[model samples]
Target chain A: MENPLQKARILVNQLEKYLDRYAKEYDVEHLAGPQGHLVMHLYKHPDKDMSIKDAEEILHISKSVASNLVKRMEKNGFIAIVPSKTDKRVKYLYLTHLGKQKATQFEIFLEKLHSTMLAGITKEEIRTTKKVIRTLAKNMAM
Target chain B: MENPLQKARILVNQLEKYLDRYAKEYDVEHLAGPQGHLVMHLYKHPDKDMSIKDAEEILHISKSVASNLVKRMEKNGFIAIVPSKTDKRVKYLYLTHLGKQKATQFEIFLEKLHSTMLAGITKEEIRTTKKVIRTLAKNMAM
Candidate 1:
């Protein structure tokens, strides 16, 4: 059976495995797996004063999960929490020196990964895939 | 930036969340999340005489992880492990009555999920999406 849903599921799992292997090879295994995505996000928007709320939105996780993720990242020296001067309850996330270095490697890896995955794939095909994916996400949201 | 990889990643995460919510709503939360796939696979292949090795391959997980998963499922009363009659070293997994009940729910949920996700999408679009996904998987495998 040519089940596109199953194929998509397998691809996602394989992608995670690929990311884990990359993290291991680069000696940043701690910052890999599920947490790697957040690191890459922070790397991409270094100028943005992102917070736990932003993490929750970006990672599609709950407040407690996002708080735990931030705590773990802070413990690993990959991120630091800074209290907002104007808002006592607001704390922004900033990548530490070590975090930035690791995020740099991850950013480069993502660029290479995207390039490799899209190689020989046409713009039209990519557009179709994105459309289907977006539709699937929207359907699930409902 | 129209990043197919990011979209795909988000879709996968959302799908997991959907599955989790379904499980909770149906009162089978224990047999949900990452482990639900294995349960569904077992339900689909009741006569396959599946073993731990089969699980490792199907779940794309390491042996120890698969072993632990089997143990957890057994503890949760969803599966039973029995040794082969001819080979003492060979063991197979069989779904318990409880396991089958949960698997049945999961199977139905998967069908509904697929139908919902693919709704209104043309076959041609689906074919292109699958092709792109396969290409991405191949690239990652390399």
Candidate 2:
């Protein structure tokens, strides 16, 4: 196709297959699939008090899905909830020590994944990929 | 900082969010989260005699996960099971007419997504992106 849609389809499928293989190779059963992904986002901003609404926005999941994921992660001791200082109704998700360690470990794994994926690929190629993906995010928003 | 790993992370997160939006925007709730993604793969190879084991390999999910997805799809009438002609115990998943239409509909939405994502982007940039993603698949294997 003249449009990038077909290529987008290819990348989406490729990503799915890659993640499945990565989980098997890395032994990530405890983190669950998407839950592990959600944690990685939190790891990026570990210092912030991440609200349920924040997770919903950042992860682009439904309200119920975000709420359920927070519960599951809390029950698993990977996260702790801290009520908003000024508001009783609002809560935020913070990684426990165990959860922080997992986030660091996952970061290391992703580093390996990135190194492996980008090996022998030039800087210019990578720059292009980044630009393209950024464009995608912009397009998706509009 | 020269590496594309961070960009890779951003793209992964972006992909997750984009799929969620696509489902809501397109109203394809029957295919839940990754289930919708897996169905896109199925739409690509509509005539194949896909089995649980096949999905396990293709989607890179656990056997239990594949089994459940197949049952779920079958139960929803999105797919149907056919006993293999050569083997009595083996079964395969095939798309129904409804499944085919859903696939086609999804394709249209993706086209919209693609157009939106690449509106101002160049051909050379996406070509480079495709190359990098190909390298990622290769390195992931090693």
Candidate 3:
């Protein structure tokens, strides 16, 4: 007999694969992965440049992996890691011109994709989903 | 003005960060991050040894990134890639003893994490969450 737990596990696994594929197709102008999220969030709050530690606090990845992502972003000409002028031991992230362009395109594509996704669902359902998911995040994130 | 668009975007972004934090605290012991989902799945189904092509097919990453993941997996003694006997162009993956041990511990942790995550929700709510997320994945994945 198929168990509900078994089914749930498989579905979550497959769902992630599906989402990653969708992101790549809809946003070919820039990377469609977690790196893009960090880059875009940085762009959204450009008035406040982020430190490596702060980014790790938000993204929850290891310092090493986050550093590597920054390196890859630099190699792609999208971003650069600079020493914090205020704190010599700290690194601050700043977007390059190319990074800004890429992040903007990605945000536009993501917004378009989100709108297209909600077309089938009712407005109330969307609201409930947002509320429930946001609450769930609060529990885990706190 | 904070529109639904802006509101939804912030909620979604925060939700992702929360999920990442949860993964860090309770991930499969040795494996790390969201990438562990793909790695654990591939490790579980190592039939007659796997290959980069097979892993890519299962994980659905681009060949280039799959190449890199396998390279790290190999170098870290998680798995070894060897030239296939029949086809020189192909390399097969064999899990190291250490790989199997790590995969086992990590898989159990992931399973428990998912179960714990939905603890208070009713079965029906859990099912609905999976359903809606799957539908979203359909739009976002491919």
Candidate 4:
């Protein structure tokens, strides 16, 4: 077996560079970059009522960045801020109709991308791979 | 063996919450918040000749947030900025001797943290798991 740290480090570098290319190819530009993609993907959920604070905590982003991301999304017509009726200071977010549509499109895009990569691996290999990584990431709670 | 995506989604959630708890326990006493811990973890080299742009691109952080993070570090005497000779508008970063020592200490902390989590897994499992994640992140490109 190769040095897992080296292999994983090299792979992350490749993924980072590839994503830069991907960003250019796709018009889904973001100041927040890849993490923002995940957040935007979340924004496509029609029934979810997420707050900027909750998203920050879940996404592990700073409040300022979350605010800026939401601001950018609002400008783009993809999401809207639905202010909390009980707490004026806290604002909750909802996906716009267009946001839902884009989310669906992006999910399909993700499916296609993931499907092609696991082509050679058996379902068992993929499953074990997934489980091990999941365990590792959670392990230090070790 | 469950779906890789489903497992990954779970892992992401777990990692986020784990870091939140870890940061509170470790950083709150000596540092500002999770950002400080994140910066400490991600520092691969001393910032003797590093540019603001370099830091931003490598970490996929926005310039404004980068500036704010630098400011916090400055308060702690972790880093100081020097204007670039060629580009008057640009600045380069240099960590203090104190900064290097602290960041290196943080790396040691991480190594210990990682080892505990990976205790039972075979080296081969680690290698394969890393590859699968790399493939996932890579395949997610565009």
Specify the highest-TM-score model's number.
1
With candidate 4 superimposed using the best TM-score fit, by how many Å does residue A142's alpha carbon deviate from the native? Answer: 6.5
Pairs of residues clashing in candidate 2: none
DockQ for every model comes to 0.26, 0.20, 0.07, 0.12
In terms of TM-score, which candidate is stronger, 1 or 4?
1
Better of 1 and 4 by lDDT: 1
In candidate 3, what fraction of native interface contacts survive?
0.10
For each candidate in turn, the TM-score is: 0.51, 0.45, 0.47, 0.44
- Taking every candidate in turn, the Cα RMSD to the unseen true structure, in Å, is 9.2, 11.8, 13.5, 13.6
Please provide, for model 3 over A21-133, each residue's C-alpha lDDT reduced to its tens digit, 9 standing for 90 to 100.
65576554336655787777888889996888888887777989888878888888888889977778998888889888888777776777667565566665565566556
lDDT ranking, best first: 1, 2, 3, 4
lDDT of each: 0.77, 0.72, 0.66, 0.60
**Model 4 misplaced regions, further than 4 Å:** A1-118, B1-7, B24-48, B51-65, B82-92, B134-142
The TM-score that candidate 1 achieves is 0.51
Writing each residue's lDDT as its tens digit, candidate 3 over B8-49 gives: 455555655544565566544335542455457656676656
Q: Candidate 2, residues B27-136: lDDT per residue as tens digits?
A: 66556444566677778876666777787887778988888888888887778878888996687877888777777777777677667767888998878888887887
Deviation in Å, model 3, residue A70 alpha carbon? 34
